[PDB]
Amino acid sequence: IPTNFSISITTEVMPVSMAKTSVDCNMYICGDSTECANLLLQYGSFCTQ
C-alpha cells in the first residue's frame, strides 16, 4: 500500500494540421512557353482534378 503520492505532469504532442499547399499547374506545367498550352489543353481536366 503506498504511503505518499507524487503529482507529476507529462506532455503529449499530437499534430492536428499540416501545410495547406496549393500548386498551380498553369505555371508548373508549361512555365513560359505559349505553344505549350496548346498541347496542355489537349489532355483535359488534369489541372482541374
Binding site: 498551380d24 498553369n26 505555371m27 489541372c47
Partner: protein, 50 residues
C-alpha cells in the same frame, strides 16, 4: 467557395535591352590620319570582327 479556373497577367511590353556595342570598327580612325600613300601604292587593310 468553389475554385473555377486560374488567372495570369498578360505581358504588355517587351524589354530587348542588349549589352553595349563591342569591338568598335577602326573606320573612325582610318579617316583620321596625317599621311596617306600614293594612288599606285594604295594600302589594303584587313578589317574583321568589329
Amino acid at each position: 467557395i468553389y475554385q473555377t479556373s486560374n488567372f495570369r497577367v498578360v505581358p504588355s511590353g517587351d524589354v530587348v535591352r542588349f549589352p553595349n556595342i563591342t569591338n568598335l570598327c577602326p573606320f573612325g580612325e582610318v579617316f583620321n590620319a596625317t599621311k596617306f600613300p600614293s594612288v599606285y601604292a594604295w594600302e589594303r587593310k584587313k578589317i574583321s570582327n568589329c
